Design a protein around this ligand. Structure first.
Ligand SMILES: *[C@@H]1O[C@H](CO)[C@@H](O)[C@H](O)[C@H]1NC(C)=O
Lengths: 33, 38
């Protein structure tokens, strides 16, 4: 929420994102963080 | 009173107890993993 900062993080829903990730990668059962 | 079957067995792999496990297996449904019923 902008009232505090303006930094955000990204999540891809369905991907083996090690493979097609298109810093700070981390794999989840729910996708790419 | 012996609440053995219902109380979760530590040795059981899943924390699910005897009765709980039986139930899960009966219903033919287990989506293991969600990185993608058809
Ligand atoms: C992503 O792909 C690699 C390739 O071998 C695989 O080892 C890994 O298990 C995959 N990720 C998931 C969450 O299955």
């Amino acid at each position: 929420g902008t009232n505090t900062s303006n930094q955000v993080a990204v999540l891809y829903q369905g991907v083996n994102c090690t493979e097609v990730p298109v810093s700070n990668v981390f794999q989840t059962r729910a996708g790419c963080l | 009173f012996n609440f053995s079957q219902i109380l979760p067995d530590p040795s059981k792999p899943s924390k699910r107890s005897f009765i709980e496990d039986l139930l899960f297996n009966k219903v033919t449904l287990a989506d293991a993993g969600f990185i993608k019923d058809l």
